[PDB]
Every structure is written in C-alpha cells, then in structure tokens.
Design a protein around this ligand. Structure first.
Ligand SMILES: [Mg+2]
Length: 141
C-alpha cells in the first residue's frame, strides 16, 4: 500500500499435523493433560485443517479473530460457525479418525510428545482432492 508502511509478514511459522485414531478415552486424557498450542479436529482431509490453522493464527495475531485463542479460532474457521459450541459439534474431536495439529515455536516436539505419551496410532495423512481443496479454500479464505 502506502510507501513507508510495513513490511507485512505472510509466514505463521511451523505447523505439524498427523491423522490419528482416538478413542473417547484418548480424547479425554488428551484435553486433560495438554493445554498448549495444538488442536484436535474431526475433518475430511488434511489440507482444510492446515488452511483453518493458518487463518486462525493470522486472525488471532491481527486481533481480528472471532474466538479469542488460536485453538478456539481453528474450530471456528474449520467449521465456518462463529459460535464455538456449534463449531465443536461439527468439527470437534470425535471417536475415530481425527487430525492433531500443532503450531508455534515447539510445534514438532509437542506433536511428538502428544503422540508418544498417549501411544496414539497414526494413520496415512489424507490429502483433500482438488475439488474439495478448491471449496475449502473459498470457504476459509
Ligand atoms: Mg469425521
């Protein structure tokens, strides 16, 4: 824009993700034990989780987020529901296949820590097909 302005950063830092199997039992222990820079979501494929996480990190940083924390804002952005309670219903962790995403300075170690400590089984990361990725992008960006 105007000559002399920043300098506006596109990068949000490292984001790590794994598709996992979680029992209700594992989901309980996860939320009780871990309080940091992660979220667990029930999503169709990985790309949309990454899009939601990027937007959530940026919106929080810019003070333009709907929810007040990144984990809350991931749920809002991934679901498209401004009400956190409604977002949780749609894309919150559910017994079965989930994605764990971590972000911030120690993203990779945190993801490893969650996975290792809870002996969580990883599944093949599933990419969104291009049709879905197009839709997810228009929905989120
Ligand atoms: Mg599901």
């Amino acid at each position: 824009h105007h000559h002399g302005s920043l300098e506006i950063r596109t990068k949000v830092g490292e984001i790590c993700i794994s598709k996992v199997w979680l029992t209700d039992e594992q989901i309980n222990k996860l939320f009780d034990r871990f309080k940091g820079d992660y979220q667990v979501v029930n999503a169709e494929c990985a790309d949309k989780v990454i899009f939601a996480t990027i937007i959530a990190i940026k919106a929080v940083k810019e003070g333009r987020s709907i929810a007040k924390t990144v984990p809350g804002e991931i749920l809002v952005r991934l679901s498209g529901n401004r009400q956190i309670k409604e977002a949780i219903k749609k894309v919150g962790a559910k017994e079965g296949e989930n994605y764990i995403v971590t972000f911030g300075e120690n993203a990779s170690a945190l993801l490893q820590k969650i996975l290792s400590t809870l002996e969580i089984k990883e599944l093949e990361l599933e990419r969104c097909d291009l049709e879905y990725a197009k839709k997810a992008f228009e929905d989120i960006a």
